[PDB]
Amino acid sequence: EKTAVVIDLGEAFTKCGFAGETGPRCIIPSVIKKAGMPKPIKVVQYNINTEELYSYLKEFIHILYFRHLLVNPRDRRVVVIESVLCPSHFRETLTRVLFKYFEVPSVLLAPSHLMALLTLGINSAMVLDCGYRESLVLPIYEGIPVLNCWGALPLGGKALHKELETQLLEQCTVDTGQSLPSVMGSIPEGVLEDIKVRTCFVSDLTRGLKIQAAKFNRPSPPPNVDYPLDGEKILHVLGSIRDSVVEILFEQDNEEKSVATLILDSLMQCPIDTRKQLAENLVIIGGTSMLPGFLHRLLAEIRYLVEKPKYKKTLGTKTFRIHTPPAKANCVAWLGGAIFGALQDILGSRSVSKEYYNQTGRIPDWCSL
Amino acid sequence: AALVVDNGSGMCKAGFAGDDAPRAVFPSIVGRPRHQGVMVGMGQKDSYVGDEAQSKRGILTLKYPIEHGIVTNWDDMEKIWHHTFYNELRVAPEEHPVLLTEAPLNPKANREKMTQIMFETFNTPAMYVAIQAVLSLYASGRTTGIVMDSGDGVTHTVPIYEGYALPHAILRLDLAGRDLTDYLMKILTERGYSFTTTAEREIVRDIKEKLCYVALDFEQEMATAASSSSLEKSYELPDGQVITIGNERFRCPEALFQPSFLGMESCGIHETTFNSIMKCDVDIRKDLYANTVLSGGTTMYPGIADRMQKEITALAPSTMKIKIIAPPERKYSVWIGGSILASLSTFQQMWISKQEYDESGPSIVHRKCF
Amino acid sequence: IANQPVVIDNGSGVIKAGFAGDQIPKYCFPNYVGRPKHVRVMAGALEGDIFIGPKAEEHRGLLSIRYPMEHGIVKDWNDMERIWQYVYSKDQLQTFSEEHPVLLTEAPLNPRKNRERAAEVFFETFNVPALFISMQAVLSLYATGRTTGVVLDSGDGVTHAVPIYEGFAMPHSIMRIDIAGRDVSRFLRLYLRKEGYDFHSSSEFEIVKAIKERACYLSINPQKDETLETEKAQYYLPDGSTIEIGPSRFRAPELLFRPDLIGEESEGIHEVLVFAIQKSDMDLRRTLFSNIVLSGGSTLFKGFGDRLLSEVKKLAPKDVKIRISAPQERLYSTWIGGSILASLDTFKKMWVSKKEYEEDGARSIHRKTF
Ligand SMILES: Nc1ncnc2c1ncn2[C@@H]1O[C@H](COP(=O)(O)OP(=O)(O)OP(=O)(O)O)[C@@H](O)[C@H]1O
Ligand SMILES: Nc1ncnc2c1ncn2[C@@H]1O[C@H](COP(=O)(O)OP(=O)(O)O)[C@@H](O)[C@H]1O
Ligand SMILES: Nc1ncnc2c1ncn2[C@@H]1O[C@H](COP(=O)(O)OP(=O)(O)O)[C@@H](O)[C@H]1O
């Protein structure tokens, strides 16, 4: 036979992979930066035209597998991986590129959550999905996704950068190159994100309480962890601002919004034949949330919100576990789909062909078949 | 030599002749899971059944395949059958004659269809189907006795005399604990508890059997309960919820004595049984007081024997000495009686072979099954 | 005192009130919870943001709205305290609890604790001299003038069918499933979730409600209409969000008649409906099939009555035609029935005197609850 394609829907990254590939292959930022491009073109560009994006997709895929491995994908199948909430018109436009332009043998939609389950291959599990812009707790009991148990916090990595630029735009505690306090307006997002991503260690809960105390009417924020700068302007200021981001990450201040909040929501839709199972199933996943030392703040907030009076009746006294990931950073769904597409020659029949797409041109989601 | 298979809309059992414990014991309910529209991988069985469905009860919805004898689908019933055979014994049906049961009020076309498919699908050498009550008194040790069946969805009073009996004398009301499960679930819903799926039914039937004791007069019991709420016992479910009920417990089986709880335009179990006794001989009725035999799986509740005793005690004269036969194993006793029935060679000379339907058709079902 | 008594009405989505003689409830106040979105940085503000009508239309910054009675299932009461308190405040009717007797209704299938808490408020905190609690469909019947008829209606989050002849109804024959418009709003936003739009809080929920009751209809052939093609008209928000919808603009019967296709466990209005009708007297059932009181404050879409007719045709004993009843607006009929109710001799034999409440309370509440 041959290998296959393994690509997921990532606002920041859409890696490619083969069938049963053991080990990562190549990660590239989802935006498309071309010749004479002042600012690269993203992927999450909805209610935008289809021909320009169509073209971008064509040449980007073109050079993508070129500089990946220069393979001829008109020979092997594709494993499409989803990320819900995206308009199907967009997804089908991708399909339009694939089949009506490149004519690959067959393609096949798939859920990222499935591959995450495939990392352990068990039947029932919680979903600790933490994507790039939103999160999702849509458990997979018996290897089956739990429909109404959904929710998403539009405050992911991109919004985290927005928070960073907000905080640092408020105070330029760096020097000239004498301090240049908010002199210019544009920011080096790559540098900002380098500082951010290269310094993401989560702090203690007590430290977050100190931040809360600093909100209204402070105990030693340094030794502060934040990564060097450039542009002849480097500094050593409070890196505790990232912990402030961790605090605003979970807001109960007349908002009551957190990850545990969605777990509670799931619990509300959960029936008794799901509760203890999920208490066992303390699935530990999440894409952009690669947060170092987040177990502390995380677990503490979990076992901090268990004590909520309106939720002890719902919870009782439920203990949890740590369903450790054998995979890596975000390779979870990537390699999950890789090995998942390995011997799925059987499911190659389930992989939508261009043949049927000629006379069809449509793939149905929850619609009238 | 044989193939003993006790049946039931819930409890379906199996084994062979001479065996004392039923090899097959499982809920004969059909589980149908939440087949949704989005994609999924690695699959599952189309519809798990009973224990198979109970294993994954969170999606599987064990709806009833039978309804007081009204089998919904024969196909699903056969799926239950086939898998149960190739689940418990894994033996082919051509080995020995089968043994199954049924009860009256059933249109003859059902038992005909039943046996018809039993020869179709299975091609057994011979076969046989009977009445549970026969095995009940048969395992009891009498040829003269009145019993009553209280299964999951059945109720029937059978008076026997030296083996002889009368269909006019044998009365029947196919109503049982399932109705009580509905009543109990809705009243606990009134108490403030959510109940939507079939798992709700399972948990409530569970605790239902765990708490349906039998007191005497709900007026004074209710007065004591409202007085002292100590009887209102607590119980914590698999989920953190812990309910407290005291009346509910024993007052749920009071509907058996009173259709008023459901408004059924019917009579109490005691007076119904009394009328069954009334359709007899003045001498043999006395023997019914002597042969006060009790059966039914939904009669595993303590206190009702004394209740029913007191009922008829108020009904019948003092000279009518009550002698209640109360076996606490009546549930499995039918299967056991089937094994004992499968042990008497003469009965095993009497059969329902292939050629009978092949030539005779299904009329021999009417004159041979019983 | 012989003043005009206060007639408070209810509602999971739209709650009303009035007096015995009002022909119009002066306020079409919805059932919700005004709150802050964030911790107000400065103390001494609009405490809890208890906003009503224009006060709710005043600002939107720290303003998170909720429901204090989810789908009829009320959980907390502090919101209710402030809501009722606002009504008691001299901006609604400018009267007192003591100045006028109070009439009120209650939704069925509820624990007694709700009644307990409410009466505790009305007599402890506020002081009603004579109160009452009734149903809703009865009042709608009085508004329609019928005293018989298969009553049917559906609120904002509660649906219920009650078979009635001269007011008589069997509790067994009475059916009710509490799921309506609120979840339809939840699914409208879920449709747009698939379409990728703004999803952060209750503001969008309000928007979607305006869509649901404004930029939404119901078709008749979802398979055909799904396979058809439109250009999907848009709307303009305060931002002017020109957003297209399509099938999702009318994908509601897959929640009304087919909610199970959302991997859910339900039946369908018509099913439960017909079942409840089937619980009655077959011939009286047939007669009442010609007079089926149809209502519903959320069932405000064209063509859906035809879809119901299709369900009827699939379920009625064919050639016994039952055409479409198309009552467009269904809200104040209950309020009207309550006004007519308290306006008659009714409340004189049907009040709840504060004195009797002081003597017994829940005892009196339930001894006079029927
Ligand atoms: N151990 C028990 N204690 C109390 N009640 C029981 C027990 N076992 C069964 N029951 C009652 O019996 C019913 C379950 O069905 P049962 O055990 O009578 O077999 P069955 O399937 O009814 O047999 P058939 O259908 O042929 O009568 C339920 O209504 C349940 O309340
Ligand atoms: N130690 C870390 N802590 C938190 N986040 C990290 C860490 N290391 C990398 N990341 C972030 O995880 C992100 C993965 O994003 P991803 O979920 O792949 O976005 P998308 O799904 O849109 O492709 C990377 O953008 C990276 O910035
Ligand atoms: N045009 C419409 N389409 C769908 N639903 C509507 C429409 N108009 C009102 N509704 C919903 O129906 C409800 C009215 O039903 P009603 O019987 O008044 O219940 P409630 O008293 O709980 O509001 C309103 O609360 C509203 O949310």
The Cα A275–Cα A282 span in angstroms is 11
B47 dihedral zone (left: phi>0; alpha: psi -120 to 50; beta): beta
Token output for B312: 């008829």
Do the domains B175-266 and B133-174+268-333 match in fold? no
C199 to A46: CB separation less than 8 angstroms, yes or no: no
The Cα C341–Cα C290 span in angstroms is 27
Token output for A248: 């605003």
CA distance A217 to chain C (A): 12
- Give me the phi and psi of B237, to 5 degrees please: -65, 180
Q: Which candidate, C255, C314, C325, places its Cα nearest to that of C292?
A: C325
Token output for A268: 């509300």
State the number of CA atoms in the 13 A half-sphere of C129 facing the CB: 12
Token output for B174: 């196919």
Q: Where are the domains of chain B?
A: 1-132+334-370, 133-174+268-333, 175-266
Q: How many residues does the structure list for chain C? A: 370
Residue identifier of the C-alpha nearest atom 27 of ligand 2 = A197
**Do B293 and B323 meet the contact criterion of CB atoms below 8 Å apart?**
no
B69 dihedral zone (left: phi>0; alpha: psi -120 to 50; beta): left
Q: How many other CB atoms are there within 10 angstroms of residue B141's CB atom?
A: 9
Q: Which candidate, B86, B43, B46, B81, places its Cα nearest to that of B65?
A: B81
- Give me the phi and psi of B131, to 5 degrees please: -110, 135
A85 to C264: CB separation less than 8 angstroms, yes or no: no
Class in CATH terms, B1-132+334-370: alpha beta
B239 to A272: CB separation less than 8 angstroms, yes or no: yes
**Do C7 and C19 meet the contact criterion of CB atoms below 8 Å apart?**
yes
Token output for B55: 């294993």
Q: How many other CB atoms are there within 10 angstroms of residue B319's CB atom?
A: 7
- The CATH code of the domain at B133-174+268-333 is 3.30.420.40
B263 dihedral zone (left: phi>0; alpha: psi -120 to 50; beta): left
| Bridge partners for A80 per DSSP | A7
State this model's resolution in angstroms.
Answer: 6.7
**What is the CATH architecture of C179-266?**
Alpha-Beta Complex (3.90)
Mapped onto helix, strand or coil, the DSSP state of residue C134 is: strand
C172 lies within 8 A of chain A by CB: no
b/e sequence B263-274, b meaning 16+ C-beta within 10 Å: eeeebbbbebbb
Residues 6+ apart with CB under 8 A from C308: C269, C270, C324
C-alpha of C152 from chain center: 13
**What is the CATH architecture of C137-178+267-333?**
2-Layer Sandwich (3.30)
Residues 6+ apart with CB under 8 A from A169: A182, A185, A187
Q: Chain A residues with CB-CB distance to B under 8 A?
A: 109-111, 114, 124, 141-145, 147, 271-277, 312-318, 340, 347, 365-366
Q: Which candidate, B347, B272, B260, places its Cα nearest to that of B315?
A: B272
- Minimum CA–CA partner of C74 in chain B: B192
The Cα B3–Cα A40 span in angstroms is 76
| Bridge partners for A7 per DSSP | A80
Mapped onto helix, strand or coil, the DSSP state of residue A265 is: helix
Residue ranges in B197-353 assigned as alpha helix (H): 198-211, 218-227, 247-251, 254-257, 269-278, 282-290, 304-315, 330-341
The Cα C219–Cα C256 span in angstroms is 13
Which residue do the tokens 């309480």 mark?
Answer: A209
In terms of Cβ atoms closer than 10 Å to its own Cβ (0-12, 13-18, 19+), residue C320 is exposed
In terms of Cβ atoms closer than 10 Å to its own Cβ (0-12, 13-18, 19+), residue C145 is exposed
The Cα C339–Cα C16 span in angstroms is 12
| Bridge partners for B312 per DSSP | none
The Cα A226–Cα A201 span in angstroms is 10
Residues 6+ apart with CB under 8 A from C277: C150, C161, C163, C285, C288, C289, C292
The Cα A366–Cα C37 span in angstroms is 34
C-alpha of C305 from chain center: 19
The Cα B7–Cα B370 span in angstroms is 17
For B115-119, which contacts have Cβ atoms below 8 Å and span 24 or more sequence positions?
A: B115/B352, B115/B357, B115/B362, B115/B365, B115/B369, B116/B357, B116/B362, B117/B74, B117/B78, B119/B354, B119/B357
Instruction: Decide: C12 in ligand 3 pocket, CB within 6 A.
Output: yes
Q: Which candidate, B205, B369, B215, B216, places its Cα nearest to that of B297?
A: B205
Class in CATH terms, B175-266: alpha beta
Q: Which candidate, A295, A300, A292, A287, places its Cα nearest to that of A336?
A: A287
Which ligand gives the minimal distance to the CA of C298? 3
C-alpha of C280 from chain center: 26
Token output for C61: 């910054």
In terms of Cβ atoms closer than 10 Å to its own Cβ (0-12, 13-18, 19+), residue C112 is middle
**Do B237 and A272 meet the contact criterion of CB atoms below 8 Å apart?**
yes
Nearest CB to C172; choose among B36, B196, B263 = B263
Q: For helices B177-190 and B198-211, give the axis angle rounded to 10 degrees.
A: 100
Q: What is the DSSP string of B135-152?
A: HHHHHHT-SSEEEEEE-S
Q: What is the DSSP string of B246-284?
A: SHHHHHTTHHHH-GGGT--S---HHHHHHHHHHSS-HHH
Token output for B102: 């049924």
Pairing of strands C149-154, C159-164: antiparallel
State the number of CA atoms in the 13 A half-sphere of B364 facing the CB: 17
B190 to C263: CB separation less than 8 angstroms, yes or no: no
Which residue do the tokens 């600790």 mark?
Answer: A128
Q: What is the DSSP string of A275-287?
A: HHHHHH--B---S
Q: Which candidate, B277, B333, B276, places its Cα nearest to that of B132?
A: B333
Instruction: Decide: A11 in ligand 2 pocket, CB within 6 A.
Output: yes
Residues 6+ apart with CB under 8 A from A7: A14, A15, A16, A17, A78, A79, A80, A81
- Minimum CA–CA partner of C63 in chain A: A254
- Listed in order, the ranges of chain C carrying CATH 3.90.640.10 are 179-266
Which ligand gives the minimal distance to the CA of A331? 2
**Do A266 and A146 meet the contact criterion of CB atoms below 8 Å apart?**
yes
Q: Which candidate, C84, C138, C147, places its Cα nearest to that of C108?
A: C138
Token output for C103: 């009439």
The Cα B63–Cα B54 span in angstroms is 12
Q: Which candidate, C178, C229, C187, places its Cα nearest to that of C211?
A: C187
Residues 6+ apart with CB under 8 A from A236: A224, A226
The Cα C118–Cα A349 span in angstroms is 62
Experimental method: cryo-EM
**Do A354 and A105 meet the contact criterion of CB atoms below 8 Å apart?**
yes
Mapped onto helix, strand or coil, the DSSP state of residue C131 is: strand
Q: Give B127's DSSP letter.
A: E
In terms of Cβ atoms closer than 10 Å to its own Cβ (0-12, 13-18, 19+), residue A184 is exposed
Residue ranges in chain C assigned as alpha helix (H): 78-88, 112-120, 137-144, 181-194, 202-213, 222-227, 253-256, 269-278, 282-288, 304-315, 333-342, 346-349, 354-359, 362-367
Instruction: Decide: C185 in ligand 3 pocket, CB within 6 A.
Output: no
Taking the alpha carbons of C35, C38, C42, C43 in that order, is the dihedral positive or negative?
positive
User: What is the H or E stretch that residue A296 is in?
Assistant: helix A294-305
A271 to B203: CB separation less than 8 angstroms, yes or no: no
The Cα A92–Cα B40 span in angstroms is 20
Taking the alpha carbons of A350, A353, A359, A361 in that order, is the dihedral positive or negative?
positive
**Do B295 and B154 meet the contact criterion of CB atoms below 8 Å apart?**
no
Token output for B190: 């009134």
**Do B247 and B225 meet the contact criterion of CB atoms below 8 Å apart?**
yes
The Cα B178–Cα B203 span in angstroms is 13
Q: How far is CA B52 from CA A29, A67, B27, B46, B72, in A?
A: 47, 51, 10, 11, 19
The Cα A273–Cα A281 span in angstroms is 13
**Do A95 and A107 meet the contact criterion of CB atoms below 8 Å apart?**
yes
Instruction: Decide: B136 in ligand 1 pocket, CB within 6 A.
Output: no
User: What is the H or E stretch that residue C200 is in?
Assistant: none
- Listed in order, the ranges of chain C carrying CATH 3.30.420.40 are 1-136+334-368, 137-178+267-333
Question: Side chain identity at A105, as an amino acid letter?
Answer: P
Token output for A304: 């901090």
CA distance B196 to chain C (A): 7
Which ligand gives the minimal distance to the CA of C28? 3
State the number of CA atoms in the 13 A half-sphere of A224 facing the CB: 20
- Minimum CA–CA partner of B37 in chain A: A366
Q: How far is CA B315 from CA A346, B157, B266, C41, C335, in A?
A: 72, 17, 18, 79, 54
User: What is the H or E stretch that residue A211 is in?
Assistant: helix A205-215
Token output for B187: 């009243």
Q: Which candidate, C15, C22, C11, places its Cα nearest to that of C337?
A: C22
Q: How far is CA C56 from CA C33, C265, C270, C284, in A?
A: 10, 36, 37, 49
In terms of Cβ atoms closer than 10 Å to its own Cβ (0-12, 13-18, 19+), residue A44 is middle
The Cα A191–Cα C345 span in angstroms is 81
Q: Which candidate, B170, B150, B102, places its Cα nearest to that of B256?
A: B150
**Do A343 and A20 meet the contact criterion of CB atoms below 8 Å apart?**
yes
CA distance A268 to chain B (A): 11
Q: How many other CB atoms are there within 10 angstroms of residue B207's CB atom?
A: 18
User: What is the H or E stretch that residue A311 is in?
Assistant: helix A309-315
Mapped onto helix, strand or coil, the DSSP state of residue B319 is: coil
**Do C121 and C81 meet the contact criterion of CB atoms below 8 Å apart?**
yes
The Cα B250–Cα B270 span in angstroms is 17
Residues 6+ apart with CB under 8 A from C46: none
The Cα C213–Cα A301 span in angstroms is 40
Token output for A5: 């394609």
The Cα A271–Cα C162 span in angstroms is 29
Q: For helices A259-269 and A272-280, give the axis angle rounded to 10 degrees.
A: 150
First to last CA, chain B: 21
Q: Chain B residues with CB-CB distance to A under 8 A?
A: 34, 36-42, 44, 56-59, 196-197, 199, 203, 237-241
In terms of Cβ atoms closer than 10 Å to its own Cβ (0-12, 13-18, 19+), residue A2 is exposed
Q: Tell me the fold of C1-136+334-368.
A: Nucleotidyltransferase; domain 5 (3.30.420)
The Cα C100–Cα C311 span in angstroms is 47
Q: Which candidate, B143, B139, B133, places its Cα nearest to that of B171?
A: B133
**Do B106 and B156 meet the contact criterion of CB atoms below 8 Å apart?**
no
Q: Which of B7, B9, B11, B101 to mutate to test the pocket of ligand 1 (most atoms within 8 A of CB)?
A: B11
Q: How many residues does the structure list for chain A? A: 369
The Cα C74–Cα C71 span in angstroms is 8
Token output for C301: 């879409």
**Do A284 and A320 meet the contact criterion of CB atoms below 8 Å apart?**
no
Question: Side chain identity at C192, as an amino acid letter?
Answer: L
**Do A317 and B239 meet the contact criterion of CB atoms below 8 Å apart?**
no
Token output for A86: 């995206």
Q: Which candidate, B335, B292, B296, places its Cα nearest to that of B130?
A: B335
The side-by-side arrangement of strands in the sheet containing C352-353 is C6-7, C102-105, C130-134, C352-353
